[PDB]
Design a protein around this ligand. Structure first.
Ligand SMILES: *[C@@H]1O[C@H](CO)[C@@H](O)[C@H](O)[C@H]1NC(C)=O
Ligand SMILES: *[C@@H]1O[C@H](CO)[C@@H](O)[C@H](O)[C@H]1NC(C)=O
Lengths: 10, 528, 518
């Protein structure tokens, strides 16, 4: 369900 | 504004399917524009989904596998750099993971050797720079996707200069999702900027038809220096210098200290040392861009030649048994028309000035891993023979030698090109000659002749041309192409091989400065 | 804004980046490309941002930069420019700027419907879509020098902007400069060559399938607002190349196939009506001619019935057979040839361009009248070809029915066409049983895409070459694990190739070669 350019976060 | 509708995009994919339109008739010159091209990280395959609006252009049928759709690299029909996809119906998405969408327009390509600076600039950076500019909206919006499988490499900071968006590697794709789908993706690279081939079929050398000039090279260089935050102001006066590339590693200039002093005294100019290992690449470009002369052993660091100012001289040194005419990637770059650079090659001829290292590992020129009969053939060979690419042990053995430069020999070599101090615009072609006319002549006892006339090319009315000549060809209806003539002015009358009714085909073209050959006007049929 | 544009052009100059390494597949993106109406020349102005990619040097005139029309490197449709320093604009007229992004191309024959669709509309439709922001913004610039032509409404369907002809350019100013212009057309959708070097026929490597043709057809149908019950459609002509017994043909087709049979015409119907009637026709019957290019609008399962006049061999003139028989079109094709010299009406007194032969001397028009089949020829004005193709034809109904019946049993009204992936985990292993004799076992996993497919017939082709011979030897298998024994020698190196085949004709890619030792 992801339309992401997205940053991480560990 | 910020339009993020996953269901609508998902139904566009499930109902419409993948859309593909590509340039070129052959796979070695094909760049593909994709819409809703998908990548399965599990299968490690790009996926074409057939739906209601699907387009496959070209539609090669079984020929899509002879050998593939396109070249992902610029190393032309390699074997390991092909791009292709597998076909599925869009309805098959019901049995697959929920896709993750890349809303960025993407450029998908393969880097050939991210660790070698020559490969980085010649195979990747220059092709990427101008592939992006082929399509509107890519130059400042596209995110680069590298699918070759290498890590970041030693020069990843250079790839990030091409785009505001951080490039992605194939290994990073699995973290985004099991099934990636690009809403808008371009695949492939232009080969138009390449000038050298690395010798996979025949020995290495320059390309037969180089389609790039120094001007296009320098526009790319100007872009890179701006991204590196390197000004374009230049040095003052009296602060000019000769730049010498240095190494800690191997392939060393053993008498570097003597070389620096000798060059400084001979050419009346400060000398500076530069190193890829000891300088940030921005400092390397800063130094190279003011260098009046660049001296370096043959190696990947010489690709920085493209940053040199107009009028500089490249001095490339080749170790013992290495024929400079066999290894010319930087000679070709320096001598490109429009580069405005001079090239000089020096070859160590004296075996007492070389230091070999036979006991090193194979990739550092060692020959200890070979049969002693082939060690003997290598140690006795006076010149590396022509060979095919990549892991030739005699080539590696000789290119990893250390070199004591014969300074008088080198100065003579440079002095054949640089007559005074080293360091610091045209190139246009004529148009067609206009209103080309010919007039046969009745003379005496039915003698014939031919008088041809024409006007100057239309663009010559605004031009500053030193030498303007015209080339005229004759012929004989159905026989070999006659005499060619080169004349100064727009008139002439001929005399040889004349006489009655013969169809004489006449071609005229204007030539600027020796070599700038203009186009031929329409042929003139002149009956006698 | 005009001062800024004039500043960019004079300081920056022209910018060019082109597709392809040859001039026959080159499409060029231009910035600040200029055109002189006086000299009738495109101008590249060199500024301090100018890029010329490719930079061909003197090879830019061998023969030119690119093709402006899709009829392959035609001597009359070459594009090129002349070079000038951007500073030369100081002695030139104040340029007029075209703000719209432009696509510049040449139409080959705006008066012929086949040329319009095959050479222009289809290449334009997909050249537009090659570059982002063109399909809905570009203004077409036709530079071939023809007028609007007989079908200018069709060109207007592509682009929301009014296309411009070359004659309209001089109206705008002595010096035009396009801020953003694309030049050239893709040849990727074409399937036919008209016969300039060798006789006309299909292209050797057709790179378009029926699906790409149909997607274009639905676009045109939407822009035309045209998006018993079953019927046979007879495409009549009104001026020349007529069917003399058209009424008898309508009744015989309607009776033989138990289907309403209806005529359509380019001259008596709007083109939107033509498309609407063709889109639902179960069968299309027509004399050979440009109107049969509407075949691309036919629904899947329809049949094309092409009628050829006396002495015209159908195998020599196949532009509509080639289009109808493209993979993915899902059409049937039938060709009928008039063999009966009394069923033809000649017209030897018409002008040369519509079949007349009285401009030829007496012996040549006699040899033409005596000839029973048009010889192979080149473009464009072969008199015997023009004479026979412009005949009128009385169709022998019994032979036509029999010819259609070899293909049809009531004119028909799904999808398919996927290729396999590579077989995976291809392995080999040898064994030496009993007395002296080798066994070579080859195994693999199914292609990854077959997991989600339903294929009527899945087979695997194994290619089994001996180290250095001209051997290969074929094998078609259904299983994925096979053991070879016959003709397998021991102590022998065997190269093995494996590929999967869907429904006999959809050949998948080969996997990496297997080297196997007995
Ligand atoms: C070297 O040249 C570049 C641009 O040509 C400039 O940014 C730099 O300041 C120059 N070097 C020095 C020491 O000024
Ligand atoms: C293929 O069949 C042979 C027996 O002929 C068997 O030994 C082998 O394990 C099989 N391989 C696979 C992958 O099923």
């Amino acid at each position: 369900a992801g339309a992401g350019a997205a940053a991480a976060a560990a | 504004a910020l339009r993020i509708d996953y269901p609508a995009a998902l139904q566009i994919l499930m109902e419409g399917g993948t859309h593909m339109v590509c340039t070129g008739r052959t796979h070695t010159d094909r760049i593909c524009r994709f819409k809703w091209l998908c990548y399965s990280n599990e299968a490690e395959e790009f996926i074409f989904f057939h739906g209601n609006t699907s387009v496959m252009l070209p539609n090669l049928g079984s020929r899509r596998f002879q050998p593939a759709l396109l070249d992902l690299s610029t190393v032309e029909d390699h074997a390991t750099q092909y791009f292709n996809f597998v076909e599925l119906p869009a309805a098959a998405l019901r049995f697959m993971p929920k896709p993750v969408f890349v809303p960025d327009v993407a450029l998908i390509a393969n880097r050939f050797n991210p660790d070698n600076l020559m490969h980085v600039f010649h195979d990747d950076l220059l092709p990427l720079f101008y592939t992006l500019r082929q399509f509107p909206g890519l130059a400042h919006e596209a995110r680069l996707f590298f699918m070759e499988g290498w890590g970041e490499g030693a020069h990843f900071d250079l790839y990030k200069l091409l785009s505001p968006k951080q490039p992605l590697l194939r290994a990073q794709l699995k973290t985004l999702g099991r099934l990636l789908c690009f809403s808008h993706a371009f695949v492939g690279l232009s080969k138009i900027t390449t000038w050298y081939q690395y010798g996979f079929v025949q020995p290495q050398g320059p390309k037969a038809n180089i389609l790039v000039s120094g001007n296009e090279i320098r526009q790319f260089a100007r872009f890179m220096t701006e991204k590196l935050n390197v000004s374009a102001t230049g040095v003052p006066l009296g602060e000019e210098y000769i730049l010498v590339f240095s190494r800690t590693q191997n392939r060393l200039i053993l008498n570097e200290a003597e070389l620096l002093l000798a060059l400084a005294q001979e050419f009346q100019m400060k000398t500076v040392t530069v190193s890829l290992e000891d300088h940030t690449f921005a400092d390397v470009v800063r130094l190279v861009s003011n260098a009046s002369m660049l001296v370096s052993m043959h190696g990947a660091q010489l690709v920085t030649t493209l940053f040199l100012p107009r009028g500089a001289t490249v001095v490339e040194l080749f170790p013992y048994a290495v024929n400079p005419d066999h290894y010319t990637p930087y000679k070709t770059l320096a001598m490109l028309p429009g580069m405005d650079l001079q090239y000089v090659a020096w070859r160590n001829m004296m075996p007492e000035n070389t230091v070999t290292h036979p006991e090193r590992p194979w990739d550092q020129g060692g020959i200890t891993h070979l049969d002693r009969a082939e060690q003997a053939r290598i140690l006795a060979s006076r010149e590396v023979p022509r060979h095919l690419c990549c892991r030739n042990p005699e080539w590696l053995f000789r290119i990893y030698q250390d070199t004591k430069v014969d300074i008088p020999s080198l100065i003579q070599t440079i002095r054949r090109v640089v007559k005074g101090r080293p360091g610091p615009a045209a190139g246009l072609y004529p148009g067609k000659v206009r209103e080309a006319r010919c007039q046969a002549s009745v003379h005496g006892a039915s003698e014939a002749r031919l008088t041809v006339s024409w006007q100057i090319p239309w663009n010559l009315k605004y031009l500053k041309v030193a030498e303007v000549k015209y080339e005229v060809w004759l012929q004989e209806a159905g026989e070999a192409a006659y005499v060619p003539y080169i004349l100064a002015l727009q008139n002439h009358t001929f005399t040889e091989n004349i006489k009655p009714f013969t169809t004489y085909l006449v071609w005229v073209r204007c030539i600027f400065n020796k070599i700038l050959l203009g186009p031929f006007a329409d042929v003139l049929v002149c009956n006698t």
